[PDB]
Amino acid sequence: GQKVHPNGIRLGIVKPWNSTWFANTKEFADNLDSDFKVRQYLTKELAKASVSRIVIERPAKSIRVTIHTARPGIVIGKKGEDVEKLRKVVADIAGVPAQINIAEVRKPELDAKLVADSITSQLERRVMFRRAMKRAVQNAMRLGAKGIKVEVSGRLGGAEIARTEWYREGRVPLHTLRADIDYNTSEAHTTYGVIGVKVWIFKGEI
Amino acid sequence: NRVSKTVKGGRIFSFTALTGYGKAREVPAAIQKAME
Amino acid sequence: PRRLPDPKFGSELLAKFVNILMVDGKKSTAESIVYSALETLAQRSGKSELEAFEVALENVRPTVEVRPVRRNALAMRWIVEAARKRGDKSMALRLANELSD
Amino acid sequence: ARIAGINIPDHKHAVIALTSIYGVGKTRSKAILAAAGIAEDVKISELSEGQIDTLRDEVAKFVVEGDLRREISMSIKRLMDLGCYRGLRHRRGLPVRGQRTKTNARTRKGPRK
Amino acid sequence: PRSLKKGPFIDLHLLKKVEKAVESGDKKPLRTWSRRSTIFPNMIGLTIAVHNGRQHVPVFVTDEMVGHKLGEFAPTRTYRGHAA
Amino acid sequence: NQYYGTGRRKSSAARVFIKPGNGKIVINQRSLEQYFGRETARMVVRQPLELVDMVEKLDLYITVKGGGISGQAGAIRHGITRALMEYDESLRSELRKAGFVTRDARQVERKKVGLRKARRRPQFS
Amino acid sequence: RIRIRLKAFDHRLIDQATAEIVETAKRTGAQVRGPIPLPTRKERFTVLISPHVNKDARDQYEIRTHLRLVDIVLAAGVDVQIS
Amino acid sequence: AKQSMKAREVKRVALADKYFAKRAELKAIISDVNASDEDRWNAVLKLQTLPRDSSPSRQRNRCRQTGRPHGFLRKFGLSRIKVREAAMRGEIPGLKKASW
RNA sequence: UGAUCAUCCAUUGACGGGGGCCCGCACAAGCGGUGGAGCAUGUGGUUUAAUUCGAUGCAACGCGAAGAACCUUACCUGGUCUUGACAUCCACGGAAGUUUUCAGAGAUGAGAAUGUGCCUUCGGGAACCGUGAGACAGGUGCUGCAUGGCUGUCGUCAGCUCGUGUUGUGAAAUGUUGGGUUAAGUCCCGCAACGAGCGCAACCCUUAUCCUUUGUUGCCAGCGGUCCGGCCGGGAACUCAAAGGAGACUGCCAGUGAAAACUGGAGGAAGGUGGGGAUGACGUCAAGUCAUCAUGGCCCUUACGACCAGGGCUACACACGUGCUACAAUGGCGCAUACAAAGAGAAGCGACCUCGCGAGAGCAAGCGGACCUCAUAAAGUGCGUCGUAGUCCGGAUUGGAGUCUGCAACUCGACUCCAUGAAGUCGGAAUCGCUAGUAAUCGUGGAUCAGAAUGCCACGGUGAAUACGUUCCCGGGCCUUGUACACACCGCCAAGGGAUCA
Ligand SMILES: CN(C)c1cc(CNCC(C)(C)C)c(O)c2c1C[C@H]1C[C@H]3[C@H](N(C)C)C(=O)C(C(N)=O)=C(O)[C@@]3(O)C(=O)C1=C2O
Ligand SMILES: CN[C@@H]1[C@H](O)[C@H](NC)[C@H]2O[C@@]3(O)C(=O)C[C@@H](C)O[C@H]3O[C@@H]2[C@H]1O
Ligand SMILES: [K+]
Ligand SMILES: [K+]
Ligand SMILES: [K+]
Ligand SMILES: [K+]
Ligand SMILES: [K+]
Ligand SMILES: [K+]
Ligand SMILES: [K+]
Ligand SMILES: [K+]
Ligand SMILES: [K+]
Ligand SMILES: [K+]
Ligand SMILES: [K+]
Ligand SMILES: [K+]
Ligand SMILES: [K+]
Ligand SMILES: [K+]
Ligand SMILES: [Mg+2]
Ligand SMILES: [Mg+2]
Ligand SMILES: [Mg+2]
Ligand SMILES: [Mg+2]
Ligand SMILES: [Mg+2]
Ligand SMILES: [Mg+2]
Ligand SMILES: [Mg+2]
Ligand SMILES: [Mg+2]
Ligand SMILES: [Mg+2]
Ligand SMILES: [Mg+2]
Ligand SMILES: [Mg+2]
Ligand SMILES: [Mg+2]
Ligand SMILES: [Mg+2]
Ligand SMILES: [Mg+2]
Ligand SMILES: [Mg+2]
Ligand SMILES: [Mg+2]
Ligand SMILES: [Mg+2]
Ligand SMILES: [Mg+2]
Ligand SMILES: [Mg+2]
Ligand SMILES: [Mg+2]
Ligand SMILES: [Mg+2]
Ligand SMILES: [Mg+2]
Ligand SMILES: [Mg+2]
Ligand SMILES: [Mg+2]
Ligand SMILES: [Mg+2]
Ligand SMILES: [Mg+2]
User: Fold this and answer.
1) Of the candidates A114, B6, D36, E43, which lies 20 to 30 Å from E5 by C-alpha distance?
2) Domain spans, chain A
3) Residues 40-99 of H with CB under 8 A from E
4) CATH number at residue C61
5) Pairwise CB contact (< 8 Å): D85 & E72
6) Are F95 and F61 in contact (CB under 8 A)?
7) Its GO biological process terms (chain A)?
């Protein structure tokens, strides 16, 4: 049957929020919609730059966007050229002053979003799905995940009948609330249609 | 040689490869077992 | 499955009786009806209100063998059921008349 | 008593007994009684003959009985002659005030044909 | 019903239509979609062709009609019985 | 000297101040019989002092907030027993044997999605 | 009187921000009357989780808005109204 | 929702803001106790001749992401579906699964 | 072969009416309902110009819709537009925009004034408009049986598997079975298995007790007054608020047991999972959703796209589902008078006061709230009245007269006033919910929302009855056996109406 979102259920238990501002009802919806337009802009611009997470704070008349990226050199650029010109667009979008900070994902093979994006990248190059899945699981366990599960669903290998296929290695205890389960998804847009990727990475209990 | 076990609601398709004699849900694992 | 004293007389049997008579949680409404009925009963009989109530139960109490908790439970349920059917004007008097009979 | 062609019940309170007149509900009743100056809860039997004449007086201020029935009948008859939507609902014997007819509407329609 | 404070609603386009009909003394049917417009006294004697959703239904205005809406005289749904 | 106890029952909370005397009962600046109408309430408030045989030896100023008549009477009783245990701790065992020292923890179970109430399901056909 | 109202969606965050204003006011010689935990608003929301039908399938969410007052006789996402 | 329907909502918001004060003025005459019947009559006939879409009640709250006109929630500005997706991704501050 | 060897007038499953052992408000025991009535609401059908589309046994039918008068709106009728309502790109025109005029249902068209700013290499503009261009936009069109995502369902049931080893020619088997035990593949013991993964449990939220900290907007025990109101000076006790701790472990005791556990006892606010919630294994039904969104393919492109007004989604011989209100006296009515919790609020909640019979209106404080407002809890209790009547029960329906929201309540709102006073007198076969602060009943609040709940989501008050038991019905678990089933009994022979022997 259907399952609770692993990130959602653990918010405030072991997982932090990605938006951390305060607002009253009058400012709340506008802040969500500006946050949406910020995250949308950056996800597009930094499609090649290995973006895992976009954390948004809003201090006193400001937006602070922290971009968690495995390739900070690509995001930052030369003399912080690229940081500064993202920062203008974010400040335009949010309609307030903006700092962009660039945080580094040191182990991208342990980042659920980066792993999911890698698989969907490979699926769109017409890499065989089983190979892409196996490589993800092996990489994460090599780099010291206590477990990983990868699910791929859709018209796998352009088959007529859609299928779900998954591999797991190690522990992925989804009912354990204190389990540090990084969970994220991605979509591969193929010639045959959408294939969904789901990745769960377990990094010990807290 | 693909073989099958029936279960409630379907069938589990498995593979066997006469190289020894192994058995696995994937083909390459069956070879590794059979070679071992 | 597969695996409190009434505050006027100290008889839990009457506390049960209030509960059987009670409808919709209205326990104070039930209590008044029963006490009114017991004093009425006593005036047209001449005992302490439990003795007449207990003699009234003895005639109803059914004897597969009924065990004595279900026995008094059935009696009281049948009394209340019998009382509610009648064409006396209030439930207090319906109950008093049914208990008398 | 007899007030406006209706034999008003003698063993009822004046407030209640007066509602037996068509065109007189509970509030017009209490209005009549407090104007004529009889208590609501006094029985119609107990009133002296002069007091009934005062009750008969206060009801003549209102439209009642066959005056009202003509008045009601004329209102409904105007609608049908007018041939407005309300009049068509009167004509067909359906709900007049926008109610559901897919189900229910049995007060107006009668029992199921 | 509309509050007495606010008075009676008619559409301005219709109020002008009806005035022009009186001034000129024309009896050619006045075509309107304003079902929600109240019938005023100066309507009397005009035929007002009221839209019912597909057709303009003529309403020769009478004195009994005044105070009612125009759309009261243009039924929208067609029903001629079931099993018939 | 006053010996205090809090009492609680459903959504009710009761502040009870016992001290020696002839046996007045104030509940929110009203007598017992003005405050509580029902005789089930009034027994329940005297149950503890009836038990310990100190009906006419102890005055009682009570405040009570929240809940209803039986809840508040139950809150009051809890507080009187809690006040008595502060006065004399020989009375604990006997008051516990009367079942008074227990905070009746039974509360209104919440309404739930798909059910009309806490447990009442909608009708099936 | 300097009267400090703090709101936050997180209670660890509000107690820290409180502790900054409070201890800082204590350092100077302003008479801090103690920090007062006011009632947390638990705002609640119930949504259908299916895109279509399945009316009994729902999620229930809550935002807890924590509230602190401190009288005198910061982290982004802590609210501050000093009157 | 279709692109046209989202664009209808934009147009209605803009006209509501354009005529807000002009609508408020004309309505205030119609509500007023102490006024002429001629000015009131005029004021009734002016309020109708404005764009219908300048009335605020012609606006439907839509999901800001999708345009869905059902299941809207005011605090988030989103439908039930996009609220849920954002909630579970940790994108709505303070919002967590509730139990009590 | 699954695999293996005009009009009203041999293996694995599955299955058995084969066997054994179990569980769940499944039955039983109860309590209250549904089915009858009126009405609300959804659906079918029928009707219609249209009655938009979707959901269809359990698991569709107060379901998507947390709110269809216009809008929403997808539908119909009619009026309209064609690079376009919504984007980018290019040429050319041009500041944006502020008023009003006429025609038109409006869309829109034709005007006529007014403003002609501001960035600024005085070099330009880029802001936002218009005309033209064709690359394209657009589609709630089709396929949920091409898909992702999300969801229902078995069911919070105790299952489902793998590695390595061992056994079998092999499909496979073992572990996972067995003896107990448990809410539980829970735990223990035995055991060719040894371990592990996903489920169970725990970690999470809330509720029941205490403690520390803190003390306003909350609080009032002791003081000092009092306009007798925590109203004021005060107090920090107490209620409470909400941070941080403590607490429950079968830990203790006794008995039973071959150990796990079970049964009772102490203490304790709480006792065996304390109560409630969140949490939904591998899979099952080509289950639901291309109309939230996304998306392969197909299809439409002066139309299947787009704009407008009016109509429809509210139709009514009828059938079905879910509700509300009743049929009274355990009650109705009148008067007086107690005790809640939880929540919402800025184009918002709106007091006091004045006016209105009332819905409401006027005036106008306060409150982005422990302060102000919504905002009298109701059932209760007391006293009075009605006296078993189709009633002083019921409140349907209809007439007249209003109020309010809204450009607008004709189709088609809610509410009030006066009048009216229908069916209904406890509901056939059949059928539903519930095991305790539950059911039942009583109010209260909230989301959607201009307005529009009898629905939904939450909150307290009062507050039961009954459970001997598992034979039977329904769903499910484990083991074993028969099988001509594998689309898997909705099958194509089970005890087939050889099994069965516990
Ligand atoms: C003609 N057939 C075989 C068929 C064919 C297709 C493919 N083409 C369909 C279409 C293009 C709409 C003509 C289909 O897509 C489908 C079905 C069967 C239905 C049956 C339906 C049924 N009723 C609702 C009617 C039911 O209760 C059950 C059930 N399992 O209980 C179902 O499976 C269904 O819901 C269903 O989903 C179907 C199909 O998809
Ligand atoms: C009552 N719940 C059942 C039960 O747990 C079944 N196992 C005995 C279980 O079996 C499965 O796991 C299966 O193996 C087969 C599938 C159709 O159902 C799955 O879900 C089945 C569950 O739905
Ligand atoms: K719509
Ligand atoms: K799907
Ligand atoms: K063999
Ligand atoms: K094995
Ligand atoms: K379905
Ligand atoms: K498609
Ligand atoms: K309409
Ligand atoms: K209708
Ligand atoms: K209903
Ligand atoms: K019904
Ligand atoms: K009557
Ligand atoms: K209407
Ligand atoms: K069997
Ligand atoms: K045979
Ligand atoms: Mg009458
Ligand atoms: Mg309740
Ligand atoms: Mg429902
Ligand atoms: Mg779209
Ligand atoms: Mg609206
Ligand atoms: Mg039964
Ligand atoms: Mg019925
Ligand atoms: Mg089906
Ligand atoms: Mg419409
Ligand atoms: Mg499907
Ligand atoms: Mg098994
Ligand atoms: Mg286990
Ligand atoms: Mg074993
Ligand atoms: Mg669990
Ligand atoms: Mg014990
Ligand atoms: Mg299908
Ligand atoms: Mg379908
Ligand atoms: Mg569709
Ligand atoms: Mg329209
Ligand atoms: Mg409808
Ligand atoms: Mg009545
Ligand atoms: Mg509200
Ligand atoms: Mg609040
Ligand atoms: Mg009759
Ligand atoms: Mg149970
Ligand atoms: Mg078992």
Assistant:
1) E43
2) 16-106, 107-206
3) 40-41, 44-45, 48-49
4) 1.10.455.10
5) yes
6) no
7) cytoplasmic translation; ribosomal small subunit assembly
